Design a protein around this ligand. Structure first.
Ligand code: HEM
Ligand SMILES: [Cl-]
Ligand SMILES: [Cl-]
Ligand SMILES: [Cl-]
Ligand SMILES: [Cl-]
Ligand SMILES: [Cl-]
Length: 153
């Protein structure tokens, strides 16, 4: 459980993110794909983009970044009461997409990296610790779900 003050820290940076969801989403996916190229394999629609320049030019890649950040944002804004949101998310990612927990760790690092880079005034040690905690809670809950659904992780 996060404290109210830790949630405030998360939601105050998140409100910066939402001034430009598309640019943020783009940076985060590209950071992910270049830090850990193997995750690109999970996307049959992206696995075919070869350079950062190509990633930057893809409109579907940008549209997908917005889908990810909007879904994560709706979860973060529940302040821990997110079970109804996780259920459909857990099902499609365990069954259809088959995404390992380890890759959720990856994108979590990408997210933290980009917020630190684009919002240092709002992402000091305290707020980064709060975001980490909030993301660990998300990954923990989706893992418990993965197992109920029959998926290893
Ligand atoms: C922050 C964590 C993530 C969130 C909130 C998220 C959210 C979503 C959402 C909302 C969709 C569309 C609806 C659905 O399929 O359920 C989706 C599709 C998808 N996601 Fe995730 N995702 C996350 C992480 C990942 C990771 C780490 C991978 C793999 C490297 C991944 C791979 C995919 C794929 C392959 C699809 C289908 C691709 C397509 O649009 O054809 N996601 N995701
Ligand atoms: Cl504001
Ligand atoms: Cl192909
Ligand atoms: Cl090709
Ligand atoms: Cl460019
Ligand atoms: Cl299926």
């Amino acid at each position: 459980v996060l404290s109210e003050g830790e949630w405030q820290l998360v939601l105050h940076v998140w409100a910066k993110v939402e001034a430009d969801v598309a640019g943020h989403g783009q940076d985060i996916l590209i950071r992910l794909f270049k830090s850990h190229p193997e995750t690109l394999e999970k996307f049959d629609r992206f696995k075919h983009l070869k350079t950062e320049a190509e990633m930057k030019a893809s409109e579907d890649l940008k549209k997908h970044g917005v889908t990810v950040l909007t879904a994560l944002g709706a979860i973060l804004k529940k302040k821990g009461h997110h079970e109804a949101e996780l259920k459909p998310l857990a099902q499609s990612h365990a069954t259809k997409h088959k995404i390992p927990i380890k890759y959720l760790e990856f994108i979590s690092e990408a997210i933290i990296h980009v917020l630190h880079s684009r919002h240092p005034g709002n992402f000091g040690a305290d707020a980064q610790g709060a975001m980490n905690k909030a993301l660990e809670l998300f990954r923990k809950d989706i893992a418990a779900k993965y197992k109920e659904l029959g998926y290893q992780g």
